[PDB]
Design a protein. Structure first.
Lengths: 86, 76, 164, 155, 181
RNA sequence: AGGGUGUGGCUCGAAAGAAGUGAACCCUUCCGAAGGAAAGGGGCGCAAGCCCUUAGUACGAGGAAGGGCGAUCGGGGUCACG
RNA sequence: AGGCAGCUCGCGGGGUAGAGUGACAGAUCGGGGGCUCCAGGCGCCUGGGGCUUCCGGUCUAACUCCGAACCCACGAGCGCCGAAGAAGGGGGGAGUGGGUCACUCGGCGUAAGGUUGGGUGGCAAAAGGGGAACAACCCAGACCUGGGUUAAGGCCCCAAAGUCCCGGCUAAGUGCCAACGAAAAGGCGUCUCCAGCCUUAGACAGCGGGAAGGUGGGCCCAGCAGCAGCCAUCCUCUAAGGAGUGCGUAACAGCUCACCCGCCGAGGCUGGAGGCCCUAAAGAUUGGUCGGGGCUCAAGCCGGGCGCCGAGACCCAGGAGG
RNA sequence: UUUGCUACAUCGAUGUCGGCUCUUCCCACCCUGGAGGUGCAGCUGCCUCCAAGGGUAGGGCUGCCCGCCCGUUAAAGGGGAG
């Protein structure tokens, strides 16, 4: 499901297969996402809900969490390198 | 997230009524460029209006705690 | 003859009576009905949205039906004032010779094809011209929209109704 | 108001009206994609407003101007006894300017006035790079202003 | 307009076992069991909570929200059917020639209408019980559609009196619903 | 349906056409007009994609040199497919 | 040794589109005041007629107190041609006097691939590239051979290049049409923008009750005991009601018309316009349609974007001729 | 499917009315089939919607076509194909 905290995989764009965390719901077809410490860095901007694939893993954050705040939640669940478990 | 309120005149054969059900709209988007593109596509698609005939006059961010319509409040 | 023949403009305005002999009398004779100078609240109007011509037959039938409807509601001299504004100045003419003179080997075919007058019409040269209006009080606003809708059915041009 | 403009004929000469074809011959634009340099004054402006549907023009800057003068070829130099001598060096300018032009004794002192029919190439990347019609009012023809300089770089 | 979020809850009462798997929802109860497929409800998430049914959809237009509220009414009909039965009544109205009706397996046979020798026959849907008391016909069952369709087949077969004659009220007609049983 | 072209099959080829003073076909190097990339690295966009570097590089019609093999090519008739 | 097919500036010419009608000539719809005659009624009132005055409204190919864009004469300047390709003068030879279509401004006509005028352009006398095929529409002017880049148009397959990207709509195979095939009317079918009016001091819909009394007042009537022929209009009242609808009925009666209670607890109602679609929408020269296959978050339509393919056009190399 | 209007095609020829013979098609439905409304009791009527699978005949009068008339019939529909 697509809700706040879900970890997704980018389908289109130059990112194309990188970890990504949903942090906000913008409108009917856009959400706000960010990549805290991607090796190249998934920047903090919008993405179309058709260009992402939700995974099964999830974190616990608040709506519109800052980038620093998100990094603390992935390490709490130990997802810093556990992203590639699927 | 910056809820925006876009106001302006759109034309079909001398058509101008600046109030709230044949003239203007409300939009929720990150910046002003995104909000304008939404207005062009929604009015151009649903009413067959080319971008010559859409005259946007005022765009400004409104505070989320004061909106007349509750449809845009519910997805916040 | 079908109204599609004399609904479009074909040529200039043809009105000068001194150069045109033998014009039939128009069907419309009374253009103002009711009690003008009465005290009224609403002044709703019938406005065209195209350019064209309206025959004097269409203009008289749209008037009888509207007057009968309003007079059916309450009374005649009572609070309504029905006014039709345009006059049929233009003269429409038909090459009738296809009927009689087109079969005597007389000037048949398109030979000597200038036509003879058959009636009059109202040229509508602007977009949004007033054709009729009716004035009533506040209690009769509804029976006045319906009178103008029924009258709009017997006219060639597409119209609206405006309230003021 | 810049002091120097460049105009390019972007259509061919078949089925062109009487008035228009004669004006383009006075501006030296006989067939498609040849350019010419003129000073900006009220006399030339009224000519471009007549043949607007067949040309595009605007004000040159240093990069557009320097690039037009370099493009000359064997039948495209200036009237060095006609012959359109390809400049390619100051050698032609060390002996030709001594008739009508003045102060031009080096390729870096050729910035003042006049030229000949500069024959160009169609634009790289599609003349429909962002358009679909050279036939549309301002869609691709007419006055474009400073944008005429990036179009010259493509051709 | 687009309703951003809409969510509804259906309470599962006691003595009812609700199972949901691959969009098929079956409800088991004292009176019987009902099985219904909801594969046509696109854009709607059906959640099987521990004590209630959860239906959710987002950004519903006039056609997606019309669908959602019909699924709600269907589910509440399944719950009711397995706790209380459904009972429709039909009345037998005759003018001159008495009408004889009898049940034979999965068919109802109506004979001696306004006088005709043809025998009118009506299908009986599965899981439905039809009995004749007198001047009345009683249709039983748990699935409301099967109970309603069966009583309507009896209704439709005897209409044919309604051909070529000004109606003088001769036929079998639906009467009421919903006894506690 | 019918001729012209491209690629193939089978046939005729003494002379008048080229050719052992070397036909035809294969390798290597060099120059190169107008035009002209991509992979890699970095940045921007929801996206298709774009911008800087790679780089006017690789390439590119034509043209010039060398090596190998060595006897057919041009031309005629007809058939298949585009 | 000058010339003018174009433009600018200067200086002049004009009565078209429009606009007006108290500025002339004609037409043309209503109201107020004053004067007069006639007719009717009991000096007055009402109607018709004529003149005058004031206020508003509708028109003109053969009306004008006005008046654009625009076109044109002359002078200067610019631009181009010119002593290689030459203003004015002289001489030899013709052909032509059936045109036609598209766009645009008209006259006649119900119209016409009609007929007759003004301006521009093709064809005639013009290939090649697109439009399914196509004298005339769009691109474009072909000396010969090779290489490249584009225009019109296109990119699911036939068939070179996108099963390209974003926001929306349509359920009819609508549609997949520049020139080429659909009107008035109806649809809250669904999608959108404006108005106005009611809403937590509990709206809309619904549900139970009060759902009414003097009186069923009444005139006329055996009786219409709202609603058969004209019509008023009063409080035991407060958290409640009007002297009151459609049915109907010989007449009733009664349901319903209208106001409060009780519940309920989120928004509701009425007008205006727009998009697409549906009905309107029926033929045969014989046998199914966007060219065909086929296509449904599209391979359709609306508002935008990105990249490619594609002429003999333009660029380059070699050759030929005047 | 009439009658006109135009003068695009055929003037070194496309045999020009009616009838008979034979074939096929359209639907805007006359009968046969289905459904409904009615100022539909029944019988008979009138009207609206679907539907072209089958049928639609014999004679008197006139060169006819149209039309009038005779005795029947479920009905004795109306048009196209140079």
């Amino acid at each position: 499901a697509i809700e706040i905290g879900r970890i997704c995989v980018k389908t289109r764009g130059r990112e194309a297969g990188k970890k990504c965390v949903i942090v906000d719901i913008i409108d009917s077809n856009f959400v706000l996402v960010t990549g805290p410490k991607e090796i190249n860095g998934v920047k903090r901007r919008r993405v179309n809900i058709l260009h992402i694939e939700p995974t099964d893993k999830k974190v616990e954050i608040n709506k519109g969490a800052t980038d620093q705040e998100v990094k603390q939640a992935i390490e709490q669940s130990g997802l810093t390198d556990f992203i590639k478990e699927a | 997230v910056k809820i925006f309120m876009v106001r302006g005149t759109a034309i079909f054969s001398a058509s101008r009524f600046p109030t709230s059900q044949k003239f203007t709209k409300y939009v929720r988007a990150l910046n002003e460029k995104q909000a304008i593109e939404y207005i062009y596509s929604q009015l151009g698609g649903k009413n067959k209006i080319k971008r010559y005939n859409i005259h946007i006059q005022e765009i400004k961010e409104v505070k989320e705690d004061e909106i007349t319509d509750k449809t845009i409040r519910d997805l916040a | 003859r079908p109204g599609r023949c004399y609904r479009k403009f074909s040529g200039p305005a043809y009105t000068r009576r001194e150069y045109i002999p033998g014009i039939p009398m128009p069907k419309i004779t009374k253009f103002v009905m009711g009690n003008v100078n009465g005290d009224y609240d609403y002044e709703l109007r019938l406005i065209t949205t195209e350019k064209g011509q309206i025959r004097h037959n269409a203009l008289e039938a749209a008037r009888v039906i509207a007057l009968k409807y309003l007079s059916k509601k309450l009374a005649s001299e009572q609070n309504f004032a029905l006014v039709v504004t345009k006059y049929p100045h233009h003269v429409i003419r038909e090459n009738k010779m296809m009927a009689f003179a087109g079969a005597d080997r007389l000037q048949d075919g398109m030979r000597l094809s200038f036509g003879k007058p058959i009636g009059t019409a109202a040229r509508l040269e602007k977009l949004g011209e007033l054709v009729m209006y009716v004035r009533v009080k506040k209690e009769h606003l509804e029976a006045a929209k319906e009178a103008l809708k029924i009258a709009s059915s017997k006219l060639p041009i597409r119209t609206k109704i405006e309230i003021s | 108001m810049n002091e120097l403009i460049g105009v390019i004929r972007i259509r061919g000469w078949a089925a062109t009206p009487w008035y228009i074809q004669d004006t383009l011959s006075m501006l030296r634009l006989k067939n498609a994609f040849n350019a010419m340099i003129y000073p900006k004054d009220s006399s030339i402006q009224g000519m471009l407003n007549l043949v607007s549907s067949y040309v595009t023009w605007g004000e040159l800057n240093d990069e557009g101007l320097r690039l037009l003068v370099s493009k000359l070829e064997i039948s495209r130099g200036k009237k060095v006894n006609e012959e359109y001598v390809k400049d390619k060096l100051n050698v032609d300018f060390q002996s030709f300017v001594e008739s009508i032009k003045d102060g031009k004794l080096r390729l870096n002192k050729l910035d003042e006035i006049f030229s000949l029919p500069i024959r160009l190439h169609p634009p790289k990347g599609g003349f429909k790079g962002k358009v679909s019609r050279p036939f549309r009012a301002g869609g691709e023809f007419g006055y474009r202003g400073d944008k005429i300089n990036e179009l010259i770089r493509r051709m | 307009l687009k309703a951003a979020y809409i969510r509804e809850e259906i309470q599962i009462p006691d003595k009812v076992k609700v199972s949901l798997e691959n969009n098929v929802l079956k409800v088991k109860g004292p009176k019987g069991e009902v099985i219904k497929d909801f594969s046509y409800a696109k854009g709607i998430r059906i959640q099987l909570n521990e004590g209630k049914i959860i239906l959710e959809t987002t950004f519903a237009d006039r056609r997606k929200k019309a669908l959602l509220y019909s699924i709600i009414a269907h589910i509440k009909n399944m719950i009711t059917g397995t706790i209380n039965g459904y009972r429709y009544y039909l009345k037998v109205i005759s003018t001159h020639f008495p009408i004889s009706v009898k049940v034979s397996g999965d068919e109802v046979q109506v004979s001696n209408l306004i006088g005709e020798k043809n025998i009118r026959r009506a299908k009986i849907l599965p899981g439905v019980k039809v009995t004749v008391k007198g001047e009345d016909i009683v249709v039983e069952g748990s699935d409301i559609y099967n109970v309603a369709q069966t009583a309507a087949n009896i209704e439709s077969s005897t209409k044919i009196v309604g051909y070529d004659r000004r109606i003088f009220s001769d036929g079998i007609y639906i009467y009421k619903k919903e006894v506690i049983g």
